[PDB]
Amino acid sequence: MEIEIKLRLPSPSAHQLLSDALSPFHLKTHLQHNLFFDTAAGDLASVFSALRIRFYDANAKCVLSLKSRPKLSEGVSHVEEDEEEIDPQIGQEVTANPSKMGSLLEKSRIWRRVVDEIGVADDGGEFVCLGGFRNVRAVYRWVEGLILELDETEYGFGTSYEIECETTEPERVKGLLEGFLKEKGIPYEYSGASKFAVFRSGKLLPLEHH
Amino acid sequence: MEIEIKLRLPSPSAHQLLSDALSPFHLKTHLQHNLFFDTAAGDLASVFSALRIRFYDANAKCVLSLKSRPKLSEGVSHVEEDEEEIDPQIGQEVTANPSKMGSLLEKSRIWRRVVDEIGVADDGGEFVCLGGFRNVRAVYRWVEGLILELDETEYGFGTSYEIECETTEPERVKGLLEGFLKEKGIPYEYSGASKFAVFRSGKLLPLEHH
Numbered sequence: 400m401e402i403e404i405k406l407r408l409p410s411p412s413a414h415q416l417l418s419d420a421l422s423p424f425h426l427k428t429h430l431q432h433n434l435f436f437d438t439a440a441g442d443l444a445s446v447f448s449a450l451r452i453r454f455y456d457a458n459a460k461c462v463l464s465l466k467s468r469p470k471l472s473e474g475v476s477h478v479e480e481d482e483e484e485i486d487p488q489i490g491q492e493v494t495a496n497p498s499k500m501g502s503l504l505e506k507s508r509i510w511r512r513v514v515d516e517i518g519v520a521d522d523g524g525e526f527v528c529l530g531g532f533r534n535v536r537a538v539y540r541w542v543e544g545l546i547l548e549l550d551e552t553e554y555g556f557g558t559s560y561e562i563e564c565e566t567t568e569p570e571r572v573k574g575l576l577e578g579f580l581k582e583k584g585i586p587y588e589y590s591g592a593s594k595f596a597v598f599r600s601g602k603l604l605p606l607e608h609h
Numbered sequence: 610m611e612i613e614i615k616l617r618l619p620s621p622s623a624h625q626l627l628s629d630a631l632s633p634f635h636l637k638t639h640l641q642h643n644l645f646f647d648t649a650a651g652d653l654a655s656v657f658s659a660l661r662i663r664f665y666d667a668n669a670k671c672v673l674s675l676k677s678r679p680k681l682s683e684g685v686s687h688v689e690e691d692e693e694e695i696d697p698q699i700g701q702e703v704t705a706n707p708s709k710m711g712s713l714l715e716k717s718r719i720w721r722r723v724v725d726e727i728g729v730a731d732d733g734g735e736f737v738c739l740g741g742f743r744n745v746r747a748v749y750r751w752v753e754g755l756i757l758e759l760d761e762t763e764y765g766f767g768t769s770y771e772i773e774c775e776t777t778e779p780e781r782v783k784g785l786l787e788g789f790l791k792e793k794g795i796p797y798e799y800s801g802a803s804k805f806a807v808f809r810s811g812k813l814l815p816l817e818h819h
């Protein structure tokens with residue numbers, strides 16, 4: 400079970416000022432392109448699952464992931480996930496011919512899980528690409544070694560900004576994180592939906608901050 | 610403050626069997642070359658500080674770090690660190706001419722901290738390379754999203770194996786980790802020294818397991 404705190408920033412200016420506030424803690428910044436896949440009939444969507452191939456920078460690194468049955472409440476996320484780095488060349492071949500996905504990913508634990516739990520045809524001739532989106536992620540090592548991820552997410556239809564923190568102590572870290580945003584004067588709200596959900600919805604959540 | 614659990618495995622066979630036990634959780638495996646730097650007079654060593662430039666795989670990624678005043682007790686590590694990814698080309702230029710380190714790293718927060726807290730000459734004409742060592746690191750996402758790092762560390766003089774876990778709950782996670790190694794039959798002891806300390810010592814800690 401993967402547990403994260405997820406807060407949304409309202410605006411470029413809030414993202415700018417938080418970015419400046421965290422700059423003493425900066426570890427790295429990288430570009431991600433996230434692509435998603437499913438059967439033509441949407442079998443994974445029907446069981447609340449998301450299959451993502453993520454490319455870092457200029458095809459430098461590639462990560463395959465299956466994420467299943469997410470829950471989100473009061474800024475706290477829980478989700479079942481299984482992910483693994485793969486050869487970016489294979490990730491690109493999958494993107495080019497997703498009907499070959501089962502043969503291309505035949506040795507993957509992740510592809511094996513897609514088959515064993517959703518019953519899709521083992522060869523993957525059914526799979527299609529859903530499209531995707533771009534994201535700039537700046538990573539910070541904060542108090543107690545906590546890792547903060549500040550995202551600038553460019554969908555086809557708009558831009559959103561979030562800050563997130565993976566932790567085993569969601570209630571106490573979320574208090575820490577909220578307390579820091581208040582003291583630095585950074586408006587925020589709890590994220591109401593994942594980036595995948597926002598992508599599929601085709602529009603930005605209404606930004607209900609007040 | 611960075612907190613990690615650090616356990617040492619005695620043997621190749623223990624490393625093999627733990628590697629197999631964690632394979633359902635495997636996220637990535639990468640090759641690291643760690644190089645270290647100090648003044649000729651050892652000013653950083655005198656204040657209990659370690660300056661490392663780490664290269665990943667074939668000069669693919671580079672990380673600069675300053676680590677200061679480490680503590681280690683009962684398998685639990687605390688250390689003050691500040692690190693940041695840098696252009697591998699610059700990391701290599703520093704390696705080639707460490708007497709140019711201050712001009713090469715002039716914009717780094719980390720180099721700035723070396724100067725501001727140890728008073729070294731700002732231009733770095735005093736710095737020399739201490740050498741380094743190689744490490745293969747396999748990364749796992751385990752229960753509650755905890756990240757386990759299983760290391761195979763090749764010093765000039767011998768090989769050591771460790772497993773480590775960064776956490777905000779050291780006492781409870783260490784119980785979890787010890788409990789899993791027992792149930793899988795993996796001998797282990799608490800790590801008695803960091804890889805940097807072992808490197809500088811020039812020999813392997815006596816492996817006092819019994």
Ligand SMILES: Nc1nc2c(ncn2[C@@H]2O[C@H](COP(=O)(O)OP(=O)(O)CP(=O)(O)O)[C@@H](O)[C@H]2O)c(=O)[nH]1
Pocket residue numbers: 403405464480482546548563564565593594748756
């Ligand atoms: N130590 C460590 N942690 C990692 C690594 N990769 C990912 N993580 C952890 O998992 C998260 C980022 O990877 P991921 O599982 O894809 O989460 P995500 O889908 O990007 C978060 P969101 O859905 O909101 O965009 C982070 O919360 C991070 O703490 C890693 O290489 N090392």
Ligand SMILES: Nc1nc2c(ncn2[C@@H]2O[C@H](COP(=O)(O)OP(=O)(O)CP(=O)(O)O)[C@@H](O)[C@H]2O)c(=O)[nH]1
Pocket residue numbers: 538546613615674690692756758773774775803804
């Ligand atoms: N989410 C996340 N965590 C990271 C990332 N990089 C490092 N970490 C965390 O910091 C540790 C690895 O980097 P580092 O600070 O150099 O520790 P180290 O010096 O390699 C540990 P040792 O000294 O025993 O070899 C891990 O414990 C990890 O959880 C990252 O990119 N993302």
Ligand SMILES: [Cl-]
Pocket residue numbers: 410412413416586
């Ligand atoms: Cl603002």
Ligand SMILES: [Cl-]
Pocket residue numbers: 427428429536537538
């Ligand atoms: Cl990143």
Ligand SMILES: [Cl-]
Pocket residue numbers: 433451594595
């Ligand atoms: Cl996503």
Ligand SMILES: [Cl-]
Pocket residue numbers: 620622623626796
């Ligand atoms: Cl053994």
Ligand SMILES: [Cl-]
Pocket residue numbers: 637638639746747748
């Ligand atoms: Cl690694």
Ligand SMILES: [Cl-]
Pocket residue numbers: 643661804805
């Ligand atoms: Cl080290």
Ligand SMILES: [Mg+2]
Pocket residue numbers: 401480
């Ligand atoms: Mg996750």
Ligand SMILES: [Mg+2]
Pocket residue numbers: 464466480481482
């Ligand atoms: Mg994931």
Ligand SMILES: [Mg+2]
Pocket residue numbers: 611690
């Ligand atoms: Mg550390």
Ligand SMILES: [Mg+2]
Pocket residue numbers: 674676690691692
């Ligand atoms: Mg460090």
